[PDB]
Structure 1
Amino acid sequence: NDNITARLDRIDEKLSEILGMLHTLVVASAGPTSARDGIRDAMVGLREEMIEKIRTEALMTNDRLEAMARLRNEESEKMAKDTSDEVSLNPTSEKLNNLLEGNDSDNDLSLEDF
């Protein structure tokens, strides 16, 4: 059967296209506009123009670097640092760590001095 299966396959082609198009969507939350005097409605668009707007700062956002990398499915820097064998300490934290270890009683610290 050629004709019926051909029509069926055209149906399935269009249908899978629609399904992919739907899986692509991204929806933005409601919010206030710049020079806030009213609430803009929630807008839904394809991903690409959305990320373009995030990149060109058309919408007020706290952080933009994480959002675009997260939408692009890639693991950013912070995430890796958040999930690692160990967490890189700070310089001042290194001073605290060196002062905690090595209890040689060199503090020469007077309670009245502080």
Structure 2
Amino acid sequence: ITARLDRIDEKLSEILGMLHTLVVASAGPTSARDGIRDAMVGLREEMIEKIRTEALMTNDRLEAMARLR
């Protein structure tokens, strides 16, 4: 059934929230803040994970060229 539009809408809501978070994290330094390191998402592990996957997909091409060698 085409009820995965619910998941698509959930992902879009997540993207909206994180976009607002980005535009406030860029410039909210004075009154949206009393110290540093505002309460936020701070999840660098998914970033490291996408870096892993992309570097591994590049290493796959390198290793295929080496296999052809």
Q: Which residue of 1 aligns with 2:6?
A: 9
Q: Could you tell me which residue of structure 2 aligns to residue 70 of structure 1? A: 67
TM-score where L is the length of structure 2 = 0.31
Which runs of 5 or more structure 2 residues have no equivalent in the other structure? none
Higher fraction of helix? 2
Q: Residues 31 and 5 (structure 1 numbering): CA distance in 2 closer, same or farther, change over 3 Å?
A: closer
Give me the CA root mean square deviation: 14.5
- Once the two structures are TM-superposed, the CA of residue 6 in structure 1 deviates from its matched residue by 1.9
Which structure 1 residue ranges, 4+ long, deviate > 2 Å from structure 2?
26-72
Structure 1: distance between partners of 2:18 and 2:58 = 26
Task: Find the residue that maps to 2:11 and give its secondary structure.
Answer: helix
**Take 1:71 and 1:28, find their aligned partners in 2: how far apart are those partners?**
48
Structure 1 gaps of 5+ residues are: 73-114
Q: Choose the corresponding residue for 1:34, options 31, 34, 44.
A: 31
Q: Matched residues in 1 for 2:68 and 2:25: separation?
A: 13
Matches within 5 A, 1:1-114: 4-26=1-23
| Cα deviation digits, residues 54-82 of structure 1 (max 9, x gap) | 9999999999999999999xxxxxxxxxx
The Cα shift of 1:25 comes to 1.2
TM-aligned CA deviation for residue 8 of structure 1: 0.8
For the pair shown, the structure with the greater C-alpha radius of gyration is 1
Point out the more displaced range, 26-35 or 59-68.
Answer: 59-68
Q: Taking CA–CA contacts closer than 8 Å with sequence separation of 6 or more, which of the two structures ends up with the larger relative contact order?
A: 2
Residues in 2 aligned to 1:35 and 1:65: alpha-carbon distance in whole angstroms: 47
Q: What is the rounded CA distance, in whole Å, between the counterparts of 2:46 and 2:10 in structure 1? A: 25
From the two aligned structures, give the one with the greater strand fraction: 1
Query: Does the C-alpha gap of structure 1 residues 55 and 22 become closer, same or farther in structure 2, counting only changes over 3 Å?
Result: same
Superposition deviation, residue 40 in structure 1: 20
| Number of aligned residue pairs | 69
